[PDB]
Ligand binder design. Sequence first.
Ligand SMILES: *C(=O)[C@H]([C@@H](C)O)[C@H]1CC(SCCNC=N)=C(C(=O)O)N1
Ligand code: NA
Length: 267
Amino acid sequence: SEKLTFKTDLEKLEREKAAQIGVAIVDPQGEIVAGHRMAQRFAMCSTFKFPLAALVFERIDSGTERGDRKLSYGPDMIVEWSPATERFLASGHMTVLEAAQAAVQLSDNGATNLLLREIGGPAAMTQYFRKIGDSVSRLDRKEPEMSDNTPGDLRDTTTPIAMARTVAKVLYGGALTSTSTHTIERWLIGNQTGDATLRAGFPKDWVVGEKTGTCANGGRNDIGFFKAQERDYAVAVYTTAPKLSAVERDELVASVGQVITQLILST
Ligand SMILES: *C(=O)[C@H]([C@@H](C)O)[C@H]1CC(SCCNC=N)=C(C(=O)O)N1
Ligand code: NA
């Protein structure tokens, strides 16, 4: 059984790395292909920035937001890991689209918070999840405190299956116009932060786009999509590995990518 091999290999990683590994893979309609701990809650950390960008694109599509609107800010908006926000600080603003692209592709925290300020805060992010059919994912705080990942805390969490289904809804389920869907996919493909994680474990000919996260207390996550030839999939990987170094957590997620690949290729 290829799915048994998948389960067994993930459990071997868990045991040897002292880790918990949550995975869900779904088809474009949100039907389950495979998973592991798929309805266990994990901290979203930076992975929520992909759904945030989807919210922004939905508002742009609808006309309730403009992509080129200038969002002004001062140094108060600079928090840890805000590379683009820092570069644009002297100019005094970033546009909605510049901020969204920095949030997705650099995981820029300042840019994320700038968009959160604009779209109605964590409550509004959570409302968007509910609107697209996700009753599980919740944002409670801005960055970086939302990534605290205190054991047991249900704030700022999702499950692998809820998030994989949200990804499928955004990319394949008509949440966005064709133009906006294409743009967000290109942003995910061009992500600058995921070279050593999930996509490092996929075949080089698969089209892959993803959004990473790193949380306190050993969280390392990666969510997105892959196209294996003509077949499209949405995937969410959430891991917790307190005893590993940062490099080893990257490698753990890449290893999960290889386990996913073995399943897809062999089935
Ligand atoms: C998201 O999970 C965190 C945010 C909560 O601070 C950011 C930080 C990182 S990695 C830290 C250094 N970044 C780049 N060199 C990520 C990430 O996407 O892995 N998101
Ligand atoms: Na300020």
